[PDB]
Design an enzyme around this catalytic site. Sequence first.
Site, short mmCIF file in Angstrom:
data_model
loop_
_atom_site.label_atom_id
_atom_site.label_comp_id
_atom_site.label_asym_id
_atom_site.label_seq_id
_atom_site.Cartn_x
_atom_site.Cartn_y
_atom_site.Cartn_z
N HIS A 18 0.83 -1.20 0.00
CA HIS A 18 0.00 0.00 0.00
C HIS A 18 0.87 1.26 0.00
O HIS A 18 0.37 2.36 -0.18
CB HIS A 18 -1.05 0.00 1.14
CG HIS A 18 -0.52 0.41 2.48
ND1 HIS A 18 -0.22 -0.50 3.47
CD2 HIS A 18 -0.30 1.63 3.01
CE1 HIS A 18 0.17 0.15 4.56
NE2 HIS A 18 0.13 1.44 4.30
N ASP A 27 -0.16 -7.54 1.55
CA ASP A 27 0.42 -6.22 1.66
C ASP A 27 1.94 -6.24 1.84
O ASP A 27 2.48 -5.80 2.87
CB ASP A 27 -0.28 -5.47 2.81
CG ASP A 27 -0.06 -3.98 2.76
OD1 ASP A 27 0.36 -3.45 1.71
OD2 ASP A 27 -0.32 -3.31 3.78
N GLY A 61 2.20 6.28 8.96
CA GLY A 61 3.57 6.77 8.90
C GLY A 61 4.53 5.65 9.27
O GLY A 61 5.71 5.67 8.90
N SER A 100 3.64 2.56 8.51
CA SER A 100 3.31 1.61 7.44
C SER A 100 4.55 1.12 6.70
O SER A 100 5.42 1.92 6.35
CB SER A 100 2.38 2.27 6.42
OG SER A 100 1.17 2.68 7.02
N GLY A 101 4.61 -0.19 6.45
CA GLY A 101 5.72 -0.79 5.74
C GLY A 101 6.92 -1.12 6.60
O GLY A 101 7.80 -1.85 6.18
N1 LIG Z 1 -1.74 -0.04 13.35
C1 LIG Z 1 -2.23 0.85 12.25
C2 LIG Z 1 -1.26 0.96 11.08
C3 LIG Z 1 -1.59 2.15 10.19
C4 LIG Z 1 -2.57 1.89 9.07
C5 LIG Z 1 -3.94 1.75 9.32
C6 LIG Z 1 -4.86 1.56 8.25
C7 LIG Z 1 -4.40 1.51 6.93
C8 LIG Z 1 -3.03 1.65 6.67
C9 LIG Z 1 -2.13 1.84 7.74
#
Ligand SMILES: NCCCc1ccccc1
Length: 222
Positions: A40, A84, A174, A176-177
């Site tokens: 994503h 993902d 932020g 993410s990944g």
């Molecule tokens: N623990 C949440 C991680 C952040 C997130 C939520 C929803 C979609 C993409 C990233």
Amino acid sequence: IVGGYECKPYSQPHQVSLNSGYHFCGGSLVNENWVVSAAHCYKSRVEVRLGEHNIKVTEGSEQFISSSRVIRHPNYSSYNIDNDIMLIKLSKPATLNTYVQPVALPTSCAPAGTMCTVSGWGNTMSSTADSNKLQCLNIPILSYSDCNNSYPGMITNAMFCAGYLEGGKDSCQGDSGGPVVCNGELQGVVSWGYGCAEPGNPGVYAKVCIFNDWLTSTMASY
Ligand SMILES: NCCCc1ccccc1
Ligand SMILES: [Ca+2]
């Protein structure tokens, strides 16, 4: 990262920041040429920043390397954020040193209850914790039952939950990944969740251990 502590500088040397003007996602260095992140977070071209602690200040330990190839898992679905995971090939090898080191891919899937570390420069939702400095958090892996109970019918074979059902501690936008490391191996990639640190809404992570085949083959293909 919500409710964590500031990581000791360079204590997570595999942590990278994906930058497109500004930091927008995290990732993990798995070898001198490849970085694992979330699908994503996909962007045709990204600048990978390694050896970072404070992302707004030059520390002298950084290496900024442009991507050569950005490969999303073939079955990634934007409709449900399934599979993902994504691979990023660096246009030039990273120099491994005190500040930059790869993290090992899993030899097997970690059982529920295993304690892990998640890190990132995402939303902290606190007045004290500065998100420009790498934040760390220890979270246990939850059982499939607990995970499915929180998100009925939304958890696939490629996802797992980690964190606390009581809330208060979690990864956030932020982050993410970014990496989820347990026993020295990369078990998860920060994926999705309902809000951050909300009770009954633990974080969801891509289950790296079921992608070893794809990861290994792709990293050998060009
Ligand atoms: N623990 C949440 C991680 C952040 C997130 C939520 C929803 C979609 C993409 C990233
Ligand atoms: Ca820096």
